[PDB]
Curated annotation (Swiss-Prot):
There is a cross-link at residue 101 (Glycyl lysine isopeptide (Lys-Gly) (interchain with G-Cter in SUMO)). Belongs to the calycin superfamily. Fatty-acid binding protein (FABP) family. The gene is CRABP2. It comes from the Eukaryota. This is Cellular retinoic acid-binding protein 2. It comes from Homo sapiens (Human). Sumoylated in response to retinoic acid binding, sumoylation is critical for dissociation from ER and subsequent nuclear translocation. PROSITE patterns: FABP (PS00214). The keyword Cytoplasm applies.
Amino acid sequence: PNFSGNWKIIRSENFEELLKVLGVNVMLRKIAVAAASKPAVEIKQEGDTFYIKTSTTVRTTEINFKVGEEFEEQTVDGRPCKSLVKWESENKMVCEQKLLKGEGPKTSWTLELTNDGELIDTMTADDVVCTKVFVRE
């Protein structure tokens, strides 16, 4: 049940389409899905404490969180939110998000490890799901 490693993306599904239904303009959508925006994910897990750094060729962000403790981040389309991660099972965490200001779609994410050691990242906004899959370097 160790999420640690340097994760490289091998599958992405419904990502631009998710951005589309959220009203993200076509320019940014095309930016977000270019080869150059391919995310590399570095995780350090120490029990329930996580450091996750997501990096592309042009952007780098990090979240530090402990499961069960509220933290602040941003939704898929960059809106500040308060997040709370909970274990759904030994190999899967789920994060509920609540906008800090205003109203919006219901957004959440999940991270889970398969027994073949792939990392599955899902992002939901209301009734729309995007799935990405990573493997370790």
